[PDB]
Amino acid sequence: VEYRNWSKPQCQITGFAPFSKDNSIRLSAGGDIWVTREPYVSCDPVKCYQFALGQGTTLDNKHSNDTVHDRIPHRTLLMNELGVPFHLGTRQVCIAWSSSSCHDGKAWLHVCITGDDKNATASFIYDGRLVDSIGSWSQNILRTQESECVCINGTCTVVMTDGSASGRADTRILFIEEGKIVHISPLAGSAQHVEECSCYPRYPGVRCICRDNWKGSNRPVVDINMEDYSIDSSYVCSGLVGDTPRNDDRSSNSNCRDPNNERGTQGVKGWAFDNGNDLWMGRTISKDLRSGYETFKVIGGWSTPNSKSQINRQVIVDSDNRSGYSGIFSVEGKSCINRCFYVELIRGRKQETRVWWTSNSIVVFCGTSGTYGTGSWPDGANINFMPI
Amino acid sequence: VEYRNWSKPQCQITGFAPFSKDNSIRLSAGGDIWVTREPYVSCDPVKCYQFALGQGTTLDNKHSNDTVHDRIPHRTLLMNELGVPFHLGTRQVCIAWSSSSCHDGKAWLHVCITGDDKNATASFIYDGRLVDSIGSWSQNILRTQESECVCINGTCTVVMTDGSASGRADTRILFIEEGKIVHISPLAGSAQHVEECSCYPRYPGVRCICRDNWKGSNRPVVDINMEDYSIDSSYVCSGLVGDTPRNDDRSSNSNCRDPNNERGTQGVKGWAFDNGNDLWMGRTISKDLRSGYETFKVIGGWSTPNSKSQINRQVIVDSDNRSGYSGIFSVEGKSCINRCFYVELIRGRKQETRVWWTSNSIVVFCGTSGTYGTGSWPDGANINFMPI
Amino acid sequence: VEYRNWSKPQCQITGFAPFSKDNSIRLSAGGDIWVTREPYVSCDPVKCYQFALGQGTTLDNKHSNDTVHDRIPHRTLLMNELGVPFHLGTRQVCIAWSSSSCHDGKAWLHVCITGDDKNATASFIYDGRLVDSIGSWSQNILRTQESECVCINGTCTVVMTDGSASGRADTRILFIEEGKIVHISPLAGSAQHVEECSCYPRYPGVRCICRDNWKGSNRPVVDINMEDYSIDSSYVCSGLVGDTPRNDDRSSNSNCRDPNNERGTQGVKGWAFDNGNDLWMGRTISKDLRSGYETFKVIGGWSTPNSKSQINRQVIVDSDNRSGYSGIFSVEGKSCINRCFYVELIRGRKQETRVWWTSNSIVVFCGTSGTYGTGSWPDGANINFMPI
Amino acid sequence: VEYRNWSKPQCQITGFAPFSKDNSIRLSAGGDIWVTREPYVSCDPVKCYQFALGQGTTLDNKHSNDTVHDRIPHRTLLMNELGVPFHLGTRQVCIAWSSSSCHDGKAWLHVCITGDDKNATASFIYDGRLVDSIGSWSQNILRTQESECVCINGTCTVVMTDGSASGRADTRILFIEEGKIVHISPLAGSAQHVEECSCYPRYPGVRCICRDNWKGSNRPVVDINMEDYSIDSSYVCSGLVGDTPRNDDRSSNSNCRDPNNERGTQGVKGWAFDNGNDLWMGRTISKDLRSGYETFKVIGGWSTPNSKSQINRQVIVDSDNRSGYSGIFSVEGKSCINRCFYVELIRGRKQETRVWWTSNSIVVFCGTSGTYGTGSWPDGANINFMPI
Ligand SMILES: *[C@@H]1O[C@H](CO[C@H]2O[C@@H](C)[C@@H](O)[C@@H](O)[C@@H]2O)[C@@H](O[C@@H]2O[C@H](CO)[C@@H](O[C@@H]3O[C@H](CO)[C@@H](O)[C@H](O)[C@@H]3O)[C@H](O)[C@H]2NC(C)=O)[C@H](O)[C@H]1NC(C)=O
Ligand SMILES: *[C@@H]1O[C@H](CO[C@H]2O[C@@H](C)[C@@H](O)[C@@H](O)[C@@H]2O)[C@@H](O[C@@H]2O[C@H](CO)[C@@H](O[C@@H]3O[C@H](CO)[C@@H](O)[C@H](O)[C@@H]3O)[C@H](O)[C@H]2NC(C)=O)[C@H](O)[C@H]1NC(C)=O
Ligand SMILES: *[C@@H]1O[C@H](CO[C@H]2O[C@@H](C)[C@@H](O)[C@@H](O)[C@@H]2O)[C@@H](O[C@@H]2O[C@H](CO)[C@@H](O[C@@H]3O[C@H](CO)[C@@H](O)[C@H](O)[C@@H]3O)[C@H](O)[C@H]2NC(C)=O)[C@H](O)[C@H]1NC(C)=O
Ligand SMILES: *[C@@H]1O[C@H](CO[C@H]2O[C@@H](C)[C@@H](O)[C@@H](O)[C@@H]2O)[C@@H](O[C@@H]2O[C@H](CO)[C@@H](O[C@@H]3O[C@H](CO)[C@@H](O)[C@H](O)[C@@H]3O)[C@H](O)[C@H]2NC(C)=O)[C@H](O)[C@H]1NC(C)=O
Ligand SMILES: *[C@@H]1O[C@H](CO)[C@@H](O[C@@H]2O[C@H](CO)[C@@H](O)[C@H](O)[C@H]2NC(C)=O)[C@H](O)[C@H]1NC(C)=O
Ligand SMILES: *[C@@H]1O[C@H](CO)[C@@H](O[C@@H]2O[C@H](CO)[C@@H](O)[C@H](O)[C@H]2NC(C)=O)[C@H](O)[C@H]1NC(C)=O
Ligand SMILES: *[C@@H]1O[C@H](CO)[C@@H](O[C@@H]2O[C@H](CO)[C@@H](O)[C@H](O)[C@H]2NC(C)=O)[C@H](O)[C@H]1NC(C)=O
Ligand SMILES: *[C@@H]1O[C@H](CO)[C@@H](O[C@@H]2O[C@H](CO)[C@@H](O)[C@H](O)[C@H]2NC(C)=O)[C@H](O)[C@H]1NC(C)=O
Ligand SMILES: *[C@@H]1O[C@H](CO)[C@@H](O[C@@H]2O[C@H](CO)[C@@H](O)[C@H](O)[C@H]2NC(C)=O)[C@H](O)[C@H]1NC(C)=O
Ligand SMILES: *[C@@H]1O[C@H](CO)[C@@H](O[C@@H]2O[C@H](CO)[C@@H](O)[C@H](O)[C@H]2NC(C)=O)[C@H](O)[C@H]1NC(C)=O
Ligand SMILES: *[C@@H]1O[C@H](CO)[C@@H](O[C@@H]2O[C@H](CO)[C@@H](O)[C@H](O)[C@H]2NC(C)=O)[C@H](O)[C@H]1NC(C)=O
Ligand SMILES: *[C@@H]1O[C@H](CO)[C@@H](O[C@@H]2O[C@H](CO)[C@@H](O)[C@H](O)[C@H]2NC(C)=O)[C@H](O)[C@H]1NC(C)=O
Ligand SMILES: CC(=O)Nc1ccc(C(=O)O)cc1NC(=O)C[NH3+]
């Protein structure tokens, strides 16, 4: 077993082909399936596994009541193979409410976070044993990537933030190799609030399209240099730019430099990636809520400030449907490394009222160089059918 | 791991011995088991796995209502080992309503199809990652083999059709090696409507006994040359010839050349195979419906037009029982490659009315050179016992 | 992987130590667990697996009604590891109502029998594929060992009988190597009715303590020579001799030669083994029914006709409890090959009336050279608790 | 595969980081999960597995009624990977009410105990087969470690006691290598009643912090020499000393030599470990009951009699919550061997009355050299939600 490093050109994609779905909510109406949220997937050198943060209970349990709450001690990192849902025999990889996982080539890595909001502990597990841990550095809800981290040449990198969500915070990028932290570096560059980074490998470094939860609808970029521990911020030029809440497409701005101050506050985890001066990107269909999902390439979306010219769009989830979080995950090809993405479709309480629980299901597509068609692959759970 | 190529003489069989059954419907009355249809099996160099197209739900679910519909986004390729039914921990290999799977020796291949009837995408997955994809080429429900494809010397071949079911259509045979499409060839020869091909390897090529859904009760043959990408049609000489609806055994014709124009329209996926001038073949017992199943060798059924002389018959499912789809699957012996076959036994709605769902179970036999006996191995689900 | 041959001295045992139990019935009252009967276990070079003949249904199913019947098409060979019960994800190894399984060293072997009582087929599966098959030879319920077969030097041997249960029958001993039958030999020696043989390896041959279901309470012996295909009968000298029904211990006879004609008819599968002139043996506690179980060595029980002198007894199941079938299974030690045994504890219909199903659970002990204590490890299912 | 021996310096810890939890009780309210108690975990060279003594039944079973009883024949050693709970497909490793398991490097070892209180049998299983067994030596409930045993250089060691709980007893330390007992040695030194030893490897020997159930609140030490078979007793100097019932922290004594005679009788399995003259140790928060849990290092707690000076405390379970048994388990690092610990959280009958069953769940932390935070990770099962 050699170490991962990703020195292959990114695959020239043409859109996204259908790749997987797990129907968690439908099956939850007839079967013992876990209550989760905040999902993600990450492929080890051999196969893709699907993660999520389960709430120490199953859906048709009485314990499902009030799962809208994000943090509880009885929360853990569920992990199965991609395709197989989170049933009663799923292992619980660690105690956690915030997470991230990667695979350096040799073995896994799971940064699991539990504890109180004021003082928390992030445990670093690698190869199955616990190797290190870190304390909160600002006493306000220490959180992490919420998706797959990336390891180049034996060294994994996960960005982490602790401070206030809608107010400035303290973010740093830890370089943790073999489960052991061998460096920490704070944020540098023009970004105002970095939360929930979707990070992909781009030789010889790492890139992150994150979540400004305080000042902007535009998305912060974070650039990590694995050979130097140097950090850099920016923003996505895309005039089309998409977080949620969002302003409007003809009234949205971005200069690639600083928050657009357009409904900035609040948001959702998202993703995007470059191709020269072009930017492939996902977004919910709506500016106001997390309903439906759409992908498209924005011409000059990576190098020209405020470019709002799009080519190649695909509806992933129909506008009359729910979505939520989402992140990108990349996988090595035998020639180039492709980039795929997952999309969490949340059902239940707060939005939906018949029921008192909150859980999600997933869908996932992958970049293709070939031709494709059309559709809308959503949840499919009649709320009147579902228990509670 | 070397590549498959199948350069062994086909085993001289004498009938079919009992091999497997999975009791899916019975167990569905007491346990969380998936709703499926369109099953099939395919043996990797080591063991046989059983596939099916599950409808994003379990049987004793409220989501089971109205599963007679063939296509929905919440449809996926379930896959377990042969014998173990599709329970709540079965992985969902991909999103799909139409499918096919093979194993080139090194790894698997799954051509999964989803999307709209007017524009669909067939995703090609190999070794776990997504390698290519293809768009619909005629805007009318792009479909595929519905059983195992065959790979000789590193190159897999799946025939595919898109166009109208009862009217002519556009069929081609794609040669897709390593998940990557490296050729496409359209249909050639005398066949009028090729759907649902049961294809087996016959060195140094591939043969397919399919489904003429528009003009004939006789079954179309398709011949693929792996070394040339050349195609050829014919029809099965068997005067006995069997699709469904079928005309009558004393009133059925076939000239090995073109549709018999005897109740031609509509049909069902089926199978058959040669042995010199002889043809071993399965068929439902009835001309009108898919009830019961029978196998037998037709003397001169492969080389003499309209031969209706049969030797060696076996009742697989009693005439007072249900059947449906069926396909052949072959497996290499340590001397010759045998040919086995599966039979889908569908229960539920449309035919059966007490319940509102549609699902199947399976049985499967294998060619033998030894002696055998008698029986009728069907479903076994008292509809009055079953939920809904 | 080399072939098994067993050229090690049998371990000098001193009684039986506790080894495993699977609580199938208790767990069946709260969980989806299979309905079975006729269990057995067999250790592959690495670990012990537990088999049984499940009735195509789960216990808290409505299909469980009337499972007292021994034969149905919807019957299969369930197989899990020893300890893990037969839950909804257990694979069904083949279609069968009568069975046997062994492991030649390289891979498994399962002689599975289905079909009609008048004409049946015994399918021979090895290494996962189907290699051969055999037809009934007398038109009256073709049956086999019902426990593990034994393979010495690449050649497996399973004894088989077809004919009437309580009247004479046609028994032969087939030598089936690599799934392929390479010889058959009929019965020889003094035995009158051989059914359900418990066969263990005794270099350089095989020995079987069976079930005379027509003329005797004494148990028939069967001796197979792997190097010659020669057969030999006898009977167990033990005056203590135990089948069921049995006569009485002070009124029981055996001359090691022919049926004692003492309640002879009917019986149950059982086991025993030699040690010089001594015979270790299991038996139900009662002469009339299958209730409780006891083991003990009978001094001179192997070489002296009618010896009824016992030393070293152990109650395995209390007299106020149920038992049933049982067989011996041996396992290689790093110095000598030990001999263990399983005991089927049947509950439900015929005997018990509250419920309408029939199923069993198991317990299993193993020979020890060390010291031991005392107990009674039975089922534990309150019939008033159980469903139906 | 080489043998374990543990010749690495113990890792200098700084407290305990969060490592795992399995939410068994919550999930038991919606799903088929086992009833257990007396849990523990033990890491094989590759991954950690979690053990427990299940009561031959599931929680929402009617058989769960009256599981407060410690011993029944229908009791077995459940074993899954750490994280995955004990669901219906968990294997039952052996019949047992008292247990211990270790891994010599090559394979496992399970000392399983069943039988009557007056005469019992402890079966020794290694590599899957049964190798030896031992009889009770005093006719009064033969018991063992109840946690992981330790094997240095091919030889495993489990301490064992048989005699009266609250009165003196007969304890010895058996050295059982390859499943075979190759020595036994009785207790030596100053200890009065040794029960439930938590034993960790400390090159080149083994150390055990046990349970004086008759004369003291202080905890007995047991020292085993693997190269000599020599034993030695002591007591923990910690004035803070903690068993339950306990006296009071300002009124508790210990001289490292003999029982403090302070509420001595009764107790609970516990743990502790040295670091020079310092002693890291767990304890329930309360002197009277098993509620809540706390860890801390006691300055001079290993070498100075009656030292009650503590530094570095952590609340693991809040004082308003339940705990119970607990043991230490160590795992090798790539530089030093760390020490972790598990904590059983029992719910149900005796204490809790709404329900009639008794079962536990678990939490588990691991030593860290890094920084940490704060919390209380308990069960989380609303007793009003739970069945029965
Ligand atoms: C789900 O929970 C809600 C409130 O959330 C918490 O409730 C706790 C106790 C627990 O479930 C935990 O999981 C959640 O964090 C329950 O809502 C209350 O239900 C009663 C039902 O009667 C409402 O009506 C009034 O209640 C009293 C008893 O409380 C009755 O005498 C009368 O009916 C009275 O009219 C009450 O106003 C509800 N409160 C809120 C804030 O909505 C809910 O019942 C539960 N539901 C389900 C389906 O599981
Ligand atoms: C299964 O579904 C049928 C119709 O199929 C769809 O129904 C939707 C809503 C959903 O289940 C989806 O899965 C299917 O695609 C249901 O049939 C209708 O049921 C009512 C029951 O009352 C019939 O009677 C009349 O209905 C109204 C309410 O609709 C009542 O006030 C009166 O009883 C009235 O007489 C109605 O005519 C049915 N329609 C059809 C086309 O048959 C069915 O109930 C459902 N069944 C089960 C057992 O799951
Ligand atoms: C289990 O089955 C028995 C008989 O065995 C078969 O039954 C079939 C239909 C199916 O279950 C299959 O699995 C078995 O091979 C059932 O017994 C009969 O039950 C009725 C119940 O009412 C008895 O009473 C009389 O029956 C009629 C309807 O049949 C009613 O109007 C009246 O109550 C009437 O008094 C009948 O005499 C029973 N027959 C026998 C031979 O015992 C049984 O009900 C079923 N039980 C359970 C708990 O699953
Ligand atoms: C759980 O068990 C208790 C007692 O424990 C044992 O019970 C056996 C039979 C079995 O469950 C085994 O698992 C346990 O070791 C049951 O308690 C008794 O229940 C009755 C219920 O009615 C109480 O009231 C009186 O009982 C008679 C019938 O026994 C009725 O006519 C009247 O109601 C009468 O007032 C009785 O006093 C209880 N005994 C004790 C010692 O508490 C319990 O019912 C059962 N419960 C559950 C929820 O599973
Ligand atoms: C990235 O990893 C691969 C794995 O070794 C390194 O390149 C391969 O390594 C050898 C020789 O370099 C052979 O496996 C192939 O020639 C290389 N590629 C592949 C796909 O096999 C590569 O050197 C590493 N990257 C860097 C920048 O050092
Ligand atoms: C990943 O590994 C390669 C493999 O060694 C690194 O490339 C080497 O760089 C060092 C000095 O920095 C040289 O000694 C080697 O000769 C270079 N390459 C190879 C293929 O040998 C590369 O820097 C690493 N990547 C990162 C991001 O640190
Ligand atoms: C089909 O595959 C086999 C796998 O290699 C090729 O034949 C075997 O290969 C070698 C030498 O040819 C040995 O494994 C045996 O002599 C061959 N057969 C078997 C069953 O082992 C074979 O050459 C391939 N077919 C063709 C037409 O090239
Ligand atoms: C499968 O592989 C064999 C193995 O090479 C092919 O047979 C060879 O054909 C080429 C030229 O076509 C020759 O160079 C080889 O010498 C031939 N055989 C062998 C055993 O070496 C065969 O064509 C392939 N089958 C198909 C259907 O393409
Ligand atoms: C039975 O099988 C074993 C497996 O090979 C044969 O004996 C072993 O084989 C070699 C050399 O004979 C070594 O593995 C050991 O010396 C033998 N025993 C063991 C336990 O390892 C043995 O020869 C076979 N029996 C006969 C009768 O030929
Ligand atoms: C099991 O195998 C051994 C291993 O060969 C057999 O013993 C050999 O017998 C042949 C002639 O019968 C000789 O050529 C060998 O030299 C003998 N033994 C060995 C260890 O080489 C033995 O017969 C076989 N057992 C059975 C029951 O057939
Ligand atoms: C404990 O086990 C290890 C496993 O072999 C022994 O030390 C290692 O063994 C070799 C040479 O000694 C190499 O694997 C490393 O140098 C050693 N340590 C490790 C972590 O790999 C060691 O000798 C054994 N202990 C004793 C006391 O003999
Ligand atoms: C564990 O194993 C080592 C490895 O051999 C033991 O150390 C050896 O002791 C013997 C004599 O007692 C010497 O022959 C070796 O040369 C010593 N060490 C090594 C690394 O070779 C050690 O005693 C064993 N541990 C225990 C607790 O018994
Ligand atoms: C730790 C935690 O609660 N994470 C969240 C989960 C969901 C969630 C959400 O959007 O529902 C918000 C959360 N907060 C953040 O991630 C802050 N960036």
Ligand SMILES: CC(=O)Nc1ccc(C(=O)O)cc1NC(=O)C[NH3+]
């Ligand atoms: C895509 C799709 O719906 N496939 C079918 C499934 C079943 C089905 C059937 O016969 O029930 C028919 C289908 N149509 C075709 O296969 C056309 N050849």
Ligand SMILES: CC(=O)Nc1ccc(C(=O)O)cc1NC(=O)C[NH3+]
């Ligand atoms: C084929 C079949 O029915 N086997 C039996 C099962 C159980 C059974 C029994 O004893 O319940 C009897 C059977 N008959 C035989 O084995 C004849 N020796």
Ligand SMILES: CC(=O)Nc1ccc(C(=O)O)cc1NC(=O)C[NH3+]
């Ligand atoms: C064999 C057995 O019953 N073990 C116990 C389990 C639990 C238990 C307890 O504390 O609930 C006590 C037991 N007795 C002992 O361990 C004596 N040290």
Ligand SMILES: [Ca+2]
């Ligand atoms: Ca925002």
Ligand SMILES: [Ca+2]
């Ligand atoms: Ca037709």
Ligand SMILES: [Ca+2]
């Ligand atoms: Ca008899």
Ligand SMILES: [Ca+2]
């Ligand atoms: Ca005490």
